Every structure is written in structure tokens, then in C-alpha cells.
Design a protein around this ligand. Structure first.
Ligand code: HEM
Ligand code: HEM
Ligand code: AMY
Lengths: 442, 379, 100, 59
């Protein structure tokens, strides 16, 4: 096993005199996947600039000037490659997955987008009303709105608080320009990463990137990556009630450390211990995760999940559950209680499993090519380099009970959390109450 | 239930009347009066229970006993002081509590209100006794009228009294049998108070706007618990201030002279928290009338719920009846003054007058200004 | 000589329930009739009323009121419930009479 | 920085907090009294028995 980790192929990385960092992992695999992961997002958007990164993602495929729509797609389809991607708050990417026999072809394609997007003013005015609809859809996904609102209040006033999607008013008025104003501003090599995994031979990649990414940095600026304005965490709540809904969602959380921080490990292990439930499972007998157990015994929630969504310099360590208009309270109580237990009297026998549970997701986090690239894509971008499963291993193969306690308490005990809840929540008690739920009557 | 705060027969009650109880968000101090009233019920029961530890109910020893209880028992003096004054802080809060309730039509929660009356009545009743106990000139002569006051009720009267109190004249027996009532009664107030709150909880607490509050309602605990603890100290400071700086400030000194069955003090001014009805009683020259007036003087609260006509509950949007209200509150503060005042033309008339506006303002004015304001809205 | 019209206007601003920003009807104590009335209210107006009440409460609970601007003007007060409430009442009075 | 030092060390753990209320009360008592007593007595120089106790114990 440990030998399995060790025998795992190191990841190659080397940047350009340009700025791009080119890394990737090699295997036997005929197939592969490759992508450019920009340090771009919504967080990087303004009050009138909010949306672009998206409105963008949405035209990032409809063509380039070199090869308009019908052709790009036709060139992509025709070769059997899958060009997919996203755009978060501090992370955007565009990956393709071909047969490795296309590294140089995929790579070019990549470059031709991140650099030259048609942005056909006529293509835009359509994607405009497309998003405005696609947004109206994102909307009844209470499973999400509940998170944005969480951000909305959790980081109220700052850049994170703005949703990756952006207000309707902006998407209704973004200019042919503003998009380009976004592209040319953030889409730069120093903040972009060319990563891939499959059967590829690094050098061949390099040269192709080093070949299609003929970027040239004059000024000292161009070679420098701006650090972002710190976002003020604001223990508070935001309630979008509506007893008209099947059920209510609740999401509460404390400020997260930020990728960098070594504790995100022990912390990650934390979330391992209470994990998540979801009525389909098969376990009123579940592992320690009482939140799970108790969730069953007393039919607390339809589903609950723990999360340590983190960013560059901040984060959101919490939990989110969905429950009938009626059992909302008992749930919080039982749940929030767990946090306490967690960082007041957690045991070794517990952390033991936690770890292994993480070590399982730790591994399965890297299941295939696309996913591997993700980490590489990410790793570098947010951490600085690539964290080997051999490393993560030790990182979290050395977290003892007393360490979890010391950690969670450090970020949960008597901290002012941010709660978010849409739906028939008449039953969720005020703040003070869920607030004094942060300290255990030890 | 993993809760416990809800899975325990006893424990639930608490986490259901002090924690988790839904209370309107918007609530003025006038809502503390009650939680205070409790603290009085306590302060009274606690102190008095403790003062009874030294009382000696018996003519020849009764007066002195108390004196002893003061001069001799450590802090016994403090206990007394506190007690006699709790009496007042008690009547004050009650008098305000009734106010609030009157002017937010909390009297619409009928039962919770009717029980309330009972409490008042009893609190008036229990306070009547107890004051007899120290057996001072007042104690005695109050015993003799108030009791004899049931003289009015024909047939069953003269008899009911020569029974009310001991034999045929306020004497030792009446005293012992009063102590008993006093020692007992408070515990009744406590019980009924439970019944009072029960009825309440059936119907959430009111709220100053007089419109549904389900729209808001905050968890009693986090909020109002504190709010009570605060109001506790607020209207605790005065009461204490009195008890430590000018105790007898409210207490008639005339009662510092042991009872004399032979001479009722020229200048018999009843206890302040009683004056109003007192006035009403004397300004209606006729034993029966005198009493009757009185009877209804307090036993009228029972009708307020039926003398409600406003299409709106409270009267915060009823500027008309609103001032009529203070015309009442003042018409009361008046009767009071006129009560602490001997009977001569300068007064007397003033008396029976206010002692007329009183009724009317209630029986008639209110309900009239009531419907009227509704029509000034097309209702 | 003195317009009931002129008067109502008085009382209206005098009651000053519009300072909290809620229509007349948003105040009428909720008795059996009104409840049934309001329970007949179109969901539009219901949620409207609700908020107006919750806002009212929230204000009241803060001791502060609504900017002179947001007060509702007498002539613009919307008797959103009077109509339903009335049917109700007569519906009842019709029944009450029939049961004799 | 007092307040911070305080919270972390004294007010954080509900276990600790209480402990300082106690040890604190002991201190508040002792100090409040002496202070009160003094304030009081001083506002009554030569009137208290403690003050005349001496014309059969000098001053
Ligand atoms: C419901 C609240 C109570 C009221 C309204 C009340 C009121 C009074 C009043 C006004 C007196 C006369 C005090 C004076 O001379 O100024 C009194 C005396 C006394 N009360 Fe109460 N009392 C109450 C409850 C109690 C309780 C619970 C006990 C014990 C069962 C008690 C035992 C006594 C005693 C020992 C006296 C005689 C000594 C004295 O006069 O101060 N009282 N009470
Ligand atoms: C025996 C002493 C009494 C106690 C300890 C008591 C207690 C309570 C308490 C605490 C409430 C909760 C809301 C509030 O604080 O106002 C309450 C409500 C009420 N009580 Fe009392 N009460 C007493 C006497 C009375 C009296 C004498 C009246 C009779 C007029 C009365 C009438 C009411 C009314 C109308 C309410 C309900 C409406 C509202 O709370 O807004 N109570 N009382
Ligand atoms: C073991 C202890 C059990 C607790 C009993 C205790 C319990 O009802 O405690 C509160 C809720 C009660 N008042 C209120 O709830 C309350 C309600 C609406 C608003 C406010 N605040 C205003 O802003 C309140 O304060 C207050 O009036 O005391 C009663 C009445 C009772 O206690 C009395 O029987 C004691 C008598 C019988 C000796």
C-alpha cells in the first residue's frame, strides 16, 4: 500500500519565461484530459463588473476568430474530445479530454480560447437571454441558493459575497467590451496553469504550450499577480422564508483558514467524523457520525453535508441540511451540538476512522484523468505546487484526537457563525440561540 | 427526543414557559409588569413566611411580637421593611399591569384577564389581612370597617360578619383567624397565577400593536428572560430604596400606636393602594350604596371586556379613546388624592364627581368613543 | 358644515397607523369574521399584508417608525379586506337568521 | 491586551469563566465593602460609636 503511494508517478512542472506553469502526470492511459486553470473568478469582479467571468465561460466555446463557431465545435466534436469547464469565485478552468494523441491539437485549441474568443456581438446578445434564463433555473435549486445567500451574508460587503453568476441587471447590460475588459485583464499566463493527465510525455506538452502560448511579458506588472482584497467575515444570518416550499434548507458556518493553512488537514478530518447523511443510505446504525445516526433515529433531515469550502486567504467551514418544515430545530440542535462534542470530547477511535475515510476520498478524489488534472490544475494555483497522495497521507496520517479538538475548537468554539436558510423555517430559533449553541456548557 | 429540554415531563414545562416560548418581538416594559408581579408574590411569600417565623398572633402579644421581630431578630427589621413595601411594589405593579392590559385590550384574552381580576381581588384581600396582624390602631380599625363592610349584604350580613371575624367584635379570635388566612391566601394567589398563565399561553402574549404577531415572534428565552432580569433590577431599586432609606414613607405612622378598641384615630386614612375605591365608598352616603359603589368600583374590571367596541384591539391608533384613557388614569389618581382628604366641600363634591366620571368613563364614554372612532374609518 | 370627509381624514392621520405604513384593514383586530375574511384573501394581498404587518412589528419593536415619505396617504389607503369581510358577515347573519 | 487576554484565558471555557466569577466575587466583596464602609463612615465623622467609643477609649 504505502508502497503503492510511493510508486505513484511524480508530477512534472515547469513554467515559461512567459509565466504559465506547465505541469501534469503520466500513466499508460490512451486517453487523457488537459486544461488551463485561470486564477479568475467572480471575486475578481466589480459592482458593475460582476457576471463577466460567467457570461464569458458561456462564449468561451462558441468560437474564436481563427476558427469561428461551426468549425471549433466541428473540430472538437469530429475528434471526439470533450471540452468542458467552469468558473467559481476564485477559480476558473477549461479542460478537454482526448486520446493523448491530440496533446498538441487540444493544447492549441485551449490557447485559442483563453486568448481569442469570437465574442460575436451577435452571439452575446443571445447568450445574454440564455443566462438570464439559465439563471432563473439556478434559482429554484434551493440546494444552491442557500449557499450563495450563505456567502452573501457570511462575507457580506466584500467580493466573495457576489455570486459567481452575477445580478440580472449586469447580465442584462454587459457590453461586448466589458467581457473583453475581463479577458485581457485576468486571462494571463502567470495566473494560468496548463495541466494534464493520461499518457502524455511532459516535454511534448511543454513544447506545444511553449509553442501555442507565445505570450510575451514586457513590464514588471505583466509578470506580477495581484493579491486580493481581504474579505471580512461577518457572523450573521440571512433568512429567505417561504412556507410555500416543500422544505427548508439551513447552512451555518465559521470562517475558514485558507488553502495555505496546514490545519485544513486536521480540519478536513473533522468533517470526516460527522460526514453526511441522505435518506437513501442504509444506516440508522451508521458509523460514529451520530449526526447521521441521530438523523435517522429521530428522522431529523432529508440530507445533511459537512463542508470546508476554502479559498485563497479565507474559508467557510460549516454544515448544510435539508429538513421538513417541522424537524428543523431538533436537527440544528443535534447537529450544532456535534460540532461541540467534536471539539470538546472527540476520541481517538473516532479520528482513526475519520482519517481512513478521508484517505478513501483522498484517493478517489483522483479517479481518472479529468479529476487528476483538476488537482494539478488546482494544487499549483492555490497551494503553489502539487501535493502528492504520499504527502496528503502523512499530513492527515498524523492527526490525533487531541489535534482535532485543538483545531475545531480553534475555529468553532464561541465563534459567531453565519447561518442561511430559505424555506418554511418558522421553526428555526433566532440567532442568539443558535449562537449560544457554539459554546458547550462544559 | 435527544432534546431532553422537551422530553422531560417537568423539565419541558420550563423549556416551554421560559425558553422556547413564542413571544411577540415588539413588547414594551408594560409587559414586564407580571413577571414583576411574580417577584412580588415571591418577595412577599418569602419575606412573610420568614416574618411569620416570629409573629405571635394574639392580641396581647401580636403588636409587640412584630416590634420584637424587628428590634430583636437579626435583619428582622429589614425583613419587615421589605415586606410592607413589597405590598406596595406589589400593588404598584398590579395597578400598572392592569393599566397596560386595559390599554391594549389584553382584556380580550378574557379568561387570562378574568383570572387576573381574581388575583387583584385576592391580592387586595390578602393585603387587608396581614395589615391587621401587627395590630396597630390602623390594623384594628381597618379590621372593623372592611369586615363590617359586609354588614350591607342583607340577611346573611350581620351574621356573616359575626363570623367573618371571631365572635361579636374584632377581638383576638378575628386576629388569629386572620393570620391564618394571610398565611394561607398568598399561596392561593400563587396557584391562580399558574391558572392565569395557563390561560394565557393558550393564546400567545398580546403585543402593543394589537395585530397578529405570528409574523414575527421571538423565543422567550434569549430575549425576554434578560428583559425580565433587567426590569427586575429596575423596579427593584425603588422598592429597595424605600425599604432602606424611607421605609415608612408609604406607611401611615398612626399604625405605630398599638390598637385601642375604644378610640378610632381622628384621621383614619386607609392604605394608599386602597384610597380610590375608598373615596368612591364615602361619597355615596348610604351604607349599602357606599358599599355597592365600592363593590363595583373594583368588580367592574370584569366588564371591561364587554365594554370593548373598537374594531382594533389596543388603542394606539385610537387617539380619541386614548386621551379618554388618561382621563381615566388621572381620574383615578384624583379619586386617590380625594381619598387621602378629609370630608369638606372643597373635596367631597370633587369626590363624588370623579367618583362618577370613573364609572361613566368606563361604562359609557369608552364604548361610545369606541364605536365612534370606528365610524371615523367607515366601520 | 363640517365634512365627515374632512373629519375621517383627521382621524386617519390622527390614528397614525399609517406612520408604521400599514393600511386600515391591516389593523382591525382579528376576530372570527376577519379571520375567515382574511382566509379568503387572494394570495397576492395576503403576503402583501403579512410583510406590512411584520414590517410594522419590526418597526414597533425598534420603537422607530417609517420615513415621512413611506407613510401611506389617506386617499391611497386600500380597503383590501372590507369587501370580503362584509360578505362574510352577511353570510353569517344569513345563517344565524335561518337557524331560527 | 487585557480584553483579549481575558476572553481567551477567562471567558472562553465555560469552565473557567465561572471560576473567575467566584474568585472575582471574593475580591469584589472584600474591596466593595472596605470601600463602602469607608465612604460611609467618612461621611459621618465623629458621629459613630466607633468615633465616640473613645470618650471611654480616647479621641
Ligand atoms: C401576597 C402577598 C402578601 C401581602 C399582600 C402581604 C401583605 C402584608 C401586609 C401589608 C402586612 C402588614 C405589614 C405592615 O405592618 O406594614 C403583612 C404582614 C405580615 N405578613 Fe404579609 N403579606 C403577604 C404575604 C405574606 C406571606 C406569604 C406570609 C407568610 C405566610 C406573610 C406573613 C406576614 C406576617 C408575619 C405579617 C406580620 C408582621 C408585619 O406586620 O409585618 N405575609 N403582610
Ligand atoms: C397575580 C399577579 C399577577 C401576575 C403575577 C400576573 C402575571 C401575568 C403575566 C406575566 C403575564 C404575561 C404578559 C405580561 O407580563 O403582561 C400576564 C398577562 C396578563 N395578565 Fe396578569 N398577572 C397578574 C395579575 C393580573 C391582574 C390583577 C390582571 C387583571 C386585570 C391581569 C391581567 C393580565 C392580562 C390581561 C394579561 C394578558 C395580555 C397581555 O399579556 O398582553 N394579570 N399576567
Ligand atoms: C420553577 C419555576 C417555574 C417558572 C414559573 C413562572 C414563569 O411563568 O415565568 C414567567 C414566564 C412569567 N412571566 C412570563 O412568562 C412573561 C410572559 C410575557 C412577557 C414577559 N416579559 C415581559 O417583557 C414575561 O416575563 C412570570 O409572571 O412568572 C410566572 C407567573 C411563573 O411563576 C409564578 O407562578 C410563581 C408564583 C406562583 C409563586
Amino acid at each position: 500500500y504505502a508502497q503503492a503511494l510511493q510508486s505513484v508517478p511524480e508530477t512534472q512542472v515547469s513554467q515559461l519565461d512567459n509565466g504559465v506553469r506547465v505541469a501534469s502526470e503520466q500513466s499508460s492511459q490512451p486517453t487523457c484530459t488537459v486544461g488551463v486553470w485561470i486564477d479568475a473568478g467572480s471575486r475578481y469582479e466589480s459592482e458593475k463588473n460582476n457576471g463577466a467571468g460567467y457570461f464569458l465561460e458561456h462564449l468561451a466555446f462558441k468560437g474564436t476568430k481563427n476558427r469561428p463557431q461551426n468549425a471549433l465545435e466541428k473540430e472538437v466534436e469530429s475528434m471526439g474530445a470533450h471540452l468542458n469547464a467552469y468558473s467559481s469565485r476564485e477559480h476558473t478552468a477549461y479542460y478537454i479530454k482526448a486520446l493523448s494523441k491530440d496533446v498538441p491539437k487540444a493544447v492549441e485549441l485551449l490557447a485559442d480560447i483563453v486568448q481569442n474568443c469570437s465574442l460575436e456581438d451577435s452571439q452575446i446578445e443571445k447568450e445574454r437571454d440564455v443566462i438570464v434564463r439559465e439563471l432563473q433555473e439556478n434559482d429554484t435549486s434551493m440546494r444552491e441558493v442557500v449557499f450563495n445567500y450563505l456567502h452573501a451574508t457570511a462575507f457580506q460587503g466584500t467580493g466573495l459575497a457576489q455570486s459567481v453568476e452575477g445580478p440580472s441587471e449586469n447580465i442584462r447590460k454587459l457590453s461586448r467590451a466589458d467581457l473583453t475588459e475581463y479577458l485581457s485583464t485576468h486571462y494571463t499566463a502567470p495566473r494560468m496553469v496548463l495541466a494534464a493527465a493520461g499518457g502524455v510525455e511532459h516535454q511534448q506538452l511543454l513544447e506545444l504550450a511553449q509553442k501555442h502560448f507565445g505570450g510575451v511579458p514586457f513590464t514588471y506588472d505583466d509578470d506580477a499577480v495581484p493579491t486580493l482584497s481581504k474579505c471580512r467575515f461577518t457572523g450573521s444570518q440571512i433568512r429567505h422564508r417561504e412556507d410555500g416550499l416543500p422544505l427548508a434548507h439551513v447552512a451555518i458556518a465559521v470562517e475558514g483558514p485558507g488553502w495555505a493553512h496546514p490545519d485544513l488537514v486536521a480540519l478536513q478530518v473533522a468533517n470526516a467524523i460527522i460526514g453526511h447523511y441522505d435518506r437513501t443510505y442504509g444506516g440508522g446504525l451508521h458509523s460514529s457520525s451520530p449526526l447521521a445516526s441521530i438523523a435517522v433515529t429521530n428522522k431529523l433531515c432529508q440530507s445533511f453535508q459537512t463542508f470546508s469550502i476554502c479559498y485563497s486567504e479565507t474559508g467557510l467551514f460549516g454544515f448544510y441540511f435539508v429538513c421538513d418544515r417541522m424537524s428543523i430545530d431538533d436537527m440544528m440542535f443535534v447537529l450544532q451540538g456535534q460540532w461541540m462534542r467534536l471539539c470538546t470530547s472527540i476520541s481517538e477511535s473516532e479520528v482513526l476512522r475519520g482519517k481512513n475515510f478521508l484517505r478513501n476520498a483522498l484517493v478517489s478524489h483522483l479517479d481518472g484523468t479529468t479529476p487528476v488534472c483538476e488537482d494539478i490544475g488546482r494544487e499549483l494555483l492555490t497551494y503553489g505546487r502539487r501535493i502528492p497522495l504520499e504527502e496528503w497521507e502523512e499530513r492527515l496520517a498524523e492527526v490525533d484526537a487531541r489535534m482535532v479538538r485543538e483545531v475545531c475548537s480553534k475555529y468553532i468554539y464561541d465563534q459567531c457563525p453565519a447561518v442561511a436558510g430559505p424555506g418554511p423555517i418558522e421553526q428555526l430559533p433566532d440567532y442568539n440561540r443558535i449562537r449560544s449553541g457554539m459554546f458547550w456548557l462544559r | 427526543a435527544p432534546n431532553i429540554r422537551k422530553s422531560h415531563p417537568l423539565l419541558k414545562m420550563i423549556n416551554n414557559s421560559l425558553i422556547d416560548l413564542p413571544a411577540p418581538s415588539n413588547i414594551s416594559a408594560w409587559w414586564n409588569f407580571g413577571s414583576l408581579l411574580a417577584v412580588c408574590l415571591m418577595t412577599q411569600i418569602l419575606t412573610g413566611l420568614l416574618l411569620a417565623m416570629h409573629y405571635t398572633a394574639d392580641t396581647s402579644l401580636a403588636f409587640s411580637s412584630v416590634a420584637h421581630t424587628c428590634r430583636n431578630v437579626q435583619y428582622g427589621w429589614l425583613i419587615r421593611n421589605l415586606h410592607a413595601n413589597g405590598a406596595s411594589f406589589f400593588f404598584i405593579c398590579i395597578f400598572l399591569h392592569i393599566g397596560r392590559g386595559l390599554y391594549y385590550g389584553s382584556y380580550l384574552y378574557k379568561e387570562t384577564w378574568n383570572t387576573g381580576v381574581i388575583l387583584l381581588l385576592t391580592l387586595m384581600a390578602t393585603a387587608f389581612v396581614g395589615y391587621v396582624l401587627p395590630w396597630g390602631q390602623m390594623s384594628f380599625w381597618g379590621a372593623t370597617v372592611i369586615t363590617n363592610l359586609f354588614s350591607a349584604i342583607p340577611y346573611i350580613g350581620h351574621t356573616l360578619v359575626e363570623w367573618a371575624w371571631g365572635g361579636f367584635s374584632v377581638d383576638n379570635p378575628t386576629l388569629t383567624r386572620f393570620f391564618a388566612l394571610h398565611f394561607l391566601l398568598p399561596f392561593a394567589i400563587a396557584g391562580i397565577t399558574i391558572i392565569h398563565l395557563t390561560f394565557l399561553h393558550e393564546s400567545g402574549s398580546n403585543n402593543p400593536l394589537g395585530i397578529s404577531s405570528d409574523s414575527d415572534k421571538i423565543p422567550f428565552h434569549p430575549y425576554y428572560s434578560f428583559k425580565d432580569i433587567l426590569g427586575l433590577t429596575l423596579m427593584l431599586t425603588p422598592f429597595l430604596t424605600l425599604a432602606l432609606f424611607s421605609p415608612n414613607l408609604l406607611g401611615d405612622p398612626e399604625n405605630f400606636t398599638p390598637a385601642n378598641p375604644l378610640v378610632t384615630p381622628p384621621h383614619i386614612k386607609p392604605e394608599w393602594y386602597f384610597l380610590f375605591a375608598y373615596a368612591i365608598l364615602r361619597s355615596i352616603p348610604n351604607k349599602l350604596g357606599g358599599v355597592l359603589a365600592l363593590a363595583a368600583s373594583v368588580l367592574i374590571l370584569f366588564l371591561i371586556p364587554f365594554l370593548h367596541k373598537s374594531k382594533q384591539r389596543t388603542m394606539t391608533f385610537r387617539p380619541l379613546s386614548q386621551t379618554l384613557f388618561w382621563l381615566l388614569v388621572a381620574n383615578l389618581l384624583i379619586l386617590t388624592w380625594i381619598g387621602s382628604q378629609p370630608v369638606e366641600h372643597p373635596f367631597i363634591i370633587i369626590g363624588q364627581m370623579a367618583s362618577l366620571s370613573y364609572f361613566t368613563i368606563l361604562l359609557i364614554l369608552f364604548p361610545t368613543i369606541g364605536t365612534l372612532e370606528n365610524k371615523m374609518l367607515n366601520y | 358644515s363640517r365634512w365627515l370627509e374632512g373629519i375621517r381624514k383627521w382621524y386617519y392621520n390622527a390614528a397614525g397607523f399609517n406612520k408604521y405604513g400599514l393600511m386600515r384593514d391591516d389593523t382591525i383586530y382579528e376576530n372570527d369574521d376577519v379571520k375567515e375574511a382574511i382566509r379568503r384573501l387572494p394570495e397576492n394581498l395576503y403576503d402583501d399584508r403579512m410583510f406590512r404587518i411584520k414590517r410594522a412589528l419590526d418597526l414597533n419593536m425598534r420603537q422607530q417608525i417609517l420615513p415621512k415619505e413611506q407613510w401611506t396617504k389617506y386617499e391611497e389607503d386600500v380597503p383590501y379586506l372590507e369587501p370580503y369581510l362584509k360578505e362574510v358577515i352577511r353570510e353569517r347573519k344569513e345563517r344565524e337568521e335561518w337557524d331560527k | 491586551t487585557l480584553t483579549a487576554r481575558l476572553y481567551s484565558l477567562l471567558f472562553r471555557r465555560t469552565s473557567t469563566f465561572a471560576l473567575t466569577i467566584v474568585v472575582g466575587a471574593l475580591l469584589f466583596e472584600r474591596a466593595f465593602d472596605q470601600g463602602a464602609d469607608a465612604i460611609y463612615e467618612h461621611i459621618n465623622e465623629g458621629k459613630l460609636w466607633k468615633h465616640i467609643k473613645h470618650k471611654y477609649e480616647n479621641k
